[PDB]
Amino acid sequence: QELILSEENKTNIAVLNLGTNDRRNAVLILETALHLVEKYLGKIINTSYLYETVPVNYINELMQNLEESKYEENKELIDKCEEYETFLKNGKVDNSILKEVNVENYLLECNNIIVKNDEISYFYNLTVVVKTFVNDPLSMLVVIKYIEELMKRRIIDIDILFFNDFTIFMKNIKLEKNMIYKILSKYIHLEDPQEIINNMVDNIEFLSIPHVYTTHRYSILLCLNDMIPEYKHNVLNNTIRCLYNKYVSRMKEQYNINIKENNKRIYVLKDRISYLKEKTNIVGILNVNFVEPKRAVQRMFEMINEGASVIDIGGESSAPFVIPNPKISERDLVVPVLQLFQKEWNDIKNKIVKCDAKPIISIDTINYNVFKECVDNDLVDILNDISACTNNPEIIKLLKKKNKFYSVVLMHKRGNPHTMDKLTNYDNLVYDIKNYLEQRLNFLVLNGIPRYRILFDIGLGFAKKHDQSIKLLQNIHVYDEYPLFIGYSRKRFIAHCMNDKDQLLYQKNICGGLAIASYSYYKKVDLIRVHDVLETKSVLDVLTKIDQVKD
Amino acid sequence: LSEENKTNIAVLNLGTNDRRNAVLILETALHLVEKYLGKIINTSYLYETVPVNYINELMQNLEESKYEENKELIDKCEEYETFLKNGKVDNSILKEVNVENYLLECNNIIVKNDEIMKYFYNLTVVVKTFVNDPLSMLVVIKYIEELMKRIIDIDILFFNDFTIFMKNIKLEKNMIYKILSKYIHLEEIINNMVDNIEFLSIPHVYTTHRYSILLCLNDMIPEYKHNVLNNTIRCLYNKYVSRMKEQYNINIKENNKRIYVLKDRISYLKEKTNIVGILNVNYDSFSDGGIFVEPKRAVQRMFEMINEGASVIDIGGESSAPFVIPNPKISERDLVVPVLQLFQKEWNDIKNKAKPIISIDTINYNVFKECVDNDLVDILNDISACTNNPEIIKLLKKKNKFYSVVLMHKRGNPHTMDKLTNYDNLVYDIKNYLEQRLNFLVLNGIPRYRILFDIGLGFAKKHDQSIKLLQNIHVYDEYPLFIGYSRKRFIAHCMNDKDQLLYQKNICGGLAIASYSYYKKVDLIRVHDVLETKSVLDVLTKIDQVKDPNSSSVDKLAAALE
Numbered sequence A: 001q002e003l004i005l006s007e008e009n010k011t012n013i014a015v016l017n018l019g020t021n022d023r024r025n026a027v028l029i030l031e032t033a034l035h036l037v038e039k040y041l042g043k044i045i046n047t048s049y050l051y052e053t054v055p056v057n058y059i060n061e062l063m064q065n066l067e068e069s070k071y072e073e074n075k076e077l078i079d080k081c082e083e084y085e086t087f088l089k090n091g092k093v094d095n096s097i098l099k100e101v102n103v104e105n106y107l108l109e110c111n112n113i114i115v116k117n118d119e120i121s122y123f124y125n126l127t128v129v130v131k132t133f134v135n136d137p138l139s140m141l142v143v144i145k146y147i148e149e150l151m152k153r154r155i156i157d158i159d160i161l162f163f164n165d166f167t168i169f170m171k172n173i174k175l176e177k178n179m180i181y182k183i184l185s186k187y188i189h190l191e192d193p194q195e196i197i198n199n200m201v202d203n204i205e206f207l208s209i210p211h212v213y214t215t216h217r218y219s220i221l222l223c224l225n226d227m228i229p230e231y232k233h234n235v236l237n238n239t240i241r242c243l244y245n246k247y248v249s250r251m252k253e254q255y256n257i258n259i260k261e262n263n264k265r266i267y268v269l270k271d272r273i274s275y276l277k278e279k280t281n282i283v284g285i286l287n288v289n290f291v292e293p294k295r296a297v298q299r300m301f302e303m304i305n306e307g308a309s310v311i312d313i314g315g316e317s318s319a320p321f322v323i324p325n326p327k328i329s330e331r332d333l334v335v336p337v338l339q340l341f342q343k344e345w346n347d348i349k350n351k352i353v354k355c356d357a358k359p360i361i362s363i364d365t366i367n368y369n370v371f372k373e374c375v376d377n378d379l380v381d382i383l384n385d386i387s388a389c390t391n392n393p394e395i396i397k398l399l400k401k402k403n404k405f406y407s408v409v410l411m412h413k414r415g416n417p418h419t420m421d422k423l424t425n426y427d428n429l430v431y432d433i434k435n436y437l438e439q440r441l442n443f444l445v446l447n448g449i450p451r452y453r454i455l456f457d458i459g460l461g462f463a464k465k466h467d468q469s470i471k472l473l474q475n476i477h478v479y480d481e482y483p484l485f486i487g488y489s490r491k492r493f494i495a496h497c498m499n500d501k502d503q504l505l506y507q508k509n510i511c512g513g514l515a516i517a518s519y520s521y522y523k524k525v526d527l528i529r530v531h532d533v534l535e536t537k538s539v540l541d542v543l544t545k546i547d548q549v550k551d
Numbered sequence B: 001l002s003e004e005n006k007t008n009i010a011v012l013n014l015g016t017n018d019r020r021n022a023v024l025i026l027e028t029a030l031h032l033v034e035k036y037l038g039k040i041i042n043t044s045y046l047y048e049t050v051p052v053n054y055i056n057e058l059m060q061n062l063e064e065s066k067y068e069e070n071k072e073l074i075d076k077c078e079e080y081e082t083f084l085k086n087g088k089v090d091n092s093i094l095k096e097v098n099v100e101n102y103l104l105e106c107n108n109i110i111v112k113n114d115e116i117m118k119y120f121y122n123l124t125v126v127v128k129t130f131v132n133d134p135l136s137m138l139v140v141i142k143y144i145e146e147l148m149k150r151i152i153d154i155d156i157l158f159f160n161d162f163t164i165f166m167k168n169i170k171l172e173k174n175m176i177y178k179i180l181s182k183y184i185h186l187e188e189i190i191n192n193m194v195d196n197i198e199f200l201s202i203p204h205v206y207t208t209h210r211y212s213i214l215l216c217l218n219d220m221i222p223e224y225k226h227n228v229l230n231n232t233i234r235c236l237y238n239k240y241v242s243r244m245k246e247q248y249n250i251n252i253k254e255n256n257k258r259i260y261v262l263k264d265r266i267s268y269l270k271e272k273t274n275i276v277g278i279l280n281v282n283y284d285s286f287s288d289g290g291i292f293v294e295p296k297r298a299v300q301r302m303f304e305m306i307n308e309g310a311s312v313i314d315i316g317g318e319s320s321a322p323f324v325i326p327n328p329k330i331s332e333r334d335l336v337v338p339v340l341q342l343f344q345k346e347w348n349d350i351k352n353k354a355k356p357i358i359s360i361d362t363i364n365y366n367v368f369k370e371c372v373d374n375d376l377v378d379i380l381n382d383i384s385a386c387t388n389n390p391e392i393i394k395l396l397k398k399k400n401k402f403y404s405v406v407l408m409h410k411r412g413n414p415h416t417m418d419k420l421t422n423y424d425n426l427v428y429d430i431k432n433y434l435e436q437r438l439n440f441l442v443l444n445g446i447p448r449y450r451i452l453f454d455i456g457l458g459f460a461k462k463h464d465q466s467i468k469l470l471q472n473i474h475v476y477d478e479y480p481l482f483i484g485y486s487r488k489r490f491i492a493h494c495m496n497d498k499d500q501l502l503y504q505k506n507i508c509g510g511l512a513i514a515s516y517s518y519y520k521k522v523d524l525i526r527v528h529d530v531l532e533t534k535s536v537l538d539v540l541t542k543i544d545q546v547k548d549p550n551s552s553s554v555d556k557l558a559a560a561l562e
């Protein structure tokens, strides 16, 4: 009865599904659940993209009033997780403390639930892998229910897809109200904190591991495919990917349905849903290299009104052979600017209808101290790390708070402003860069950064000869699955494109970049980082008009 | 030979190997066909198909024709209409073989050629011919070839509905002469000519065997059905195309390219988007608030456009800009001829050490005449599609030169056009309209491959109609396409030092249409901002320039294996 509470400290692997119905607040709801998962269950070491599929204020108050977890939070960076490796390859783990069933019983008891439900809205999903300290899936389900109830004070559905290699079907669970309190107290410092426990007792009816709908719901396979394509559970007839591929082509050969069209991958730049590949956002460049705060802030507002969705501020040139002037530090160039902008914006904020009108703010820095100060003072939304967080990976710690995730651009480069033009050997240029960006994403994702908040940038001009920059453009389709951010603006390789004073070359350069804006638009590049906002907006508006068929 | 005063319909084929001079050679041939055989009343595109200074001084000393050249415009041709439908015609003076005997006499020549063995530029033509019979025409044709002396081959593909095969042919060194003097004032060459003419086949033997004959004929007479053929030209053409795809896995069109001509050189249809720079003399001179025309500044602008990358200059002195009232004191001709004259001068001064094609945006015959006679221009840009004065068409042919023409669609004039925007079917009414204009120039001997289409963005179109014409630009995929969006109001309609932002937005909006045009493979775009447009096209072109067409798949496999 209380052998479910035995002293033994163990680490298990759980795979969860988080679903909501609320389009408006999906991000905030799912990420609140991510936070509570990380607080109350263990460590997030994988996430899928966010998807939209076809079959408020008290949250911010809740996060202030949470009971502490009996268990540690360790933010140190990890580079491998052994239990996860073991989970993936089906290696040896401890016997389940809960009674298992064989394949036949499971398959039978699954169908029986499916058929019953076959007698008797947009969904927003995300899956998670958690390195858990919770002893067993039922205990987990109790805590998961606590979390769902916290978030009500429907709105959030949290299912257990997997839990080690276990196979479990328990038909008639009834847990006495004091047993629930006893389970929650093992994991939480329990201290109205008692009345919640009442609602939970009728909620746990049975427990199926794997979850009943795991292979029967497209939206689950979609998420799992992002994270664990090669996983094979005893109870499944193939790997996650295979099962996923079959589901796609079957709907193409049992109906005439391309399932992808109804089920959209999402990325998040700040706090809203963006559908992958549906819009080319302009990112306006603000180089503060001496540029006076007031003037810098004027330029920011000129760019908002010229059409920029995002402003990318940098205080440190990375341009070829640039030696900076130590007279003034990066911090002192960027912070006063972002503070002034935050002031001006808040003055003129409550005078007009301007909240969604606020540009997402991006900082082009590799330096942890700079980003720590921006993040502490709520001055930025995105980290633009031209070293893909390799220069100081501690920075990745700054992308999470108790109730906040920040998004990040990972760019590819080699060397520094002085050596980079000399480091241009690649066995397989297009794929070496892709593979590198994937490894960097895997490292962030292993360390709890949501997959959907990570953007890829091939870094044109950084350790690329001009013909290699072009070739990276020519092959941009290899990023069709990923949120893609590129920066071609006023780079050398553009001039390399023309045939034959500096004002004439300045203009050829702006104009050559409008060509790459056109190309980008058709290639459905998600973000483009540009100096010339007005010009870029004009181009994208025209091309959008040409594409819009009128009724 | 005895019969007199009859008119016949004959289809010819013209061929050469000289890529460098295909235009000059086929165009000379044409001139001579029009001099010595009748009126050219149809042409095909020029095609490039895989299976020098002699001519200038030749043009001066030619023998005259016995029938009068007739440059008058026509709008139908009953005979030709009768040729197409296969209606009652006179009986053949030469001896007709029947169908099976023709079929087997042909196969024989084809088969003997298959065995006997162990870039082409083509152009078909239809002739309303005074000449009496296939064989006489062949004699005159052989004279024309030798008169041009392989350098030029001119076969006879049809003569009315005749089904003819003549097995053995000796023509007396003097029997040729009497035929040749029936049509010319003869003033050495017959010696060379004798054995040349061995036999005679009508239809020509290779008529349905050579793709490059079908291709050419499909332009002109797609629905034509000869007794000898199993179906219409269009069907045999389609069959030939699909069967090459099914049976040999070959896209026959890749090696058989449609050509259009701007000046003197070959252009490959859909292979390049050409910049055409705009020189408006009214705007160049009177936008200051100034009152005097400045030819120097104007010719300075021409040179500045050549260097910025324009392949073509479009000069105009009338303004069709909406609600714009042309200046009544200084005439079009005085805005235009002087600027052109100074240009041809300074071009010839700086010609020690590339010459831009010159287009003139006029609907006025007298203006065009003075320009063409003094060799000031290469192309007629007629925004009325030659309906303001169809006689302007005559000026597109000389005895030696041909000139190219842009036909634009419009309704009304600059004060009325904006109100004239009801179309039963916008996209197709305009295309049909342009097509019917082309049928009219062609019926009058304007070479097909010298006619360019322009939908006329902004000319009697609402802004959404201009966009719609762009959305549906693919309907011109078979045709040489010339468009002008530069700075038109419909660009602003696409958007969301206040007028400078608006003029910036407008140049930039255009560069977007330049890109779209580039990808839609528009042949010519007429622009104000040349440097900007060239920069755009250069960059798009470099992105498309692949080193190895396979590497993307190969590098992908290499990566997967590692």
Ligand SMILES: Nc1ncnc2c1ncn2[C@@H]1O[C@H](COP(=O)(O)CP(=O)(O)OP(=O)(O)O)[C@@H](O)[C@H]1O
Pocket (backbone or CB within 6 Å): A141, A157, A158, A159, A160, A161, A203, A204, A205, A206, A207, A208, A209, A210, A211, A212, A213
């Ligand atoms: N792996 C698992 N994860 C979550 N709940 C499970 C489960 N196995 C069994 N259950 C039972 O089913 C209940 C889940 O309730 P809900 O999630 O609200 C049903 P639903 O969302 O309408 O459809 P779903 O079960 O297909 O998600 C749990 O309280 C528990 O009684």
Ligand SMILES: Nc1ncnc2c1ncn2[C@@H]1O[C@H](COP(=O)(O)CP(=O)(O)OP(=O)(O)O)[C@@H](O)[C@H]1O
Pocket (backbone or CB within 6 Å): B138, B153, B154, B155, B156, B157, B196, B197, B198, B199, B200, B201, B202, B203, B204, B205, B206
């Ligand atoms: N309908 C026709 N038109 C032109 N020539 C014809 C003809 N019927 C027979 N001939 C004769 O056959 C010859 C045709 O071949 P030529 O033009 O001389 C070189 P070819 O290109 O190798 O032959 P091809 O064009 O038949 O392939 C002519 O010289 C002509 O005397």
Ligand SMILES: Nc1nc2nccnc2c(=O)[nH]1
Pocket (backbone or CB within 6 Å): A318, A364, A384, A385, A386, A409, A411, A457, A459, A460, A485, A486, A487, A488, A529
């Ligand atoms: N992510 C990113 N940041 C940059 N910062 C400066 C110059 N280029 C770039 C670039 O191309 N990408």
Ligand SMILES: Nc1nc2nccnc2c(=O)[nH]1
Pocket (backbone or CB within 6 Å): B320, B361, B381, B382, B383, B406, B407, B408, B454, B456, B457, B482, B483, B484, B485, B526
């Ligand atoms: N052919 C052509 N000519 C023009 N002349 C003036 C203005 N626009 C145009 C145009 O769009 N097309």
Ligand SMILES: [Ca+2]
Pocket (backbone or CB within 6 Å): A037, A038, A039, A041, A042, A043, A044, A072, A073, A074
């Ligand atoms: Ca944790």
Ligand SMILES: [Ca+2]
Pocket (backbone or CB within 6 Å): B034, B035, B037, B038, B039, B040, B068, B069, B070
């Ligand atoms: Ca004639």
Ligand SMILES: [Mg+2]
Pocket (backbone or CB within 6 Å): A157, A158, A159
């Ligand atoms: Mg559920």
Ligand SMILES: [Mg+2]
Pocket (backbone or CB within 6 Å): B015, B153
């Ligand atoms: Mg030949």
Ligand SMILES: [Mg+2]
Pocket (backbone or CB within 6 Å): B153, B154, B155
């Ligand atoms: Mg021949």
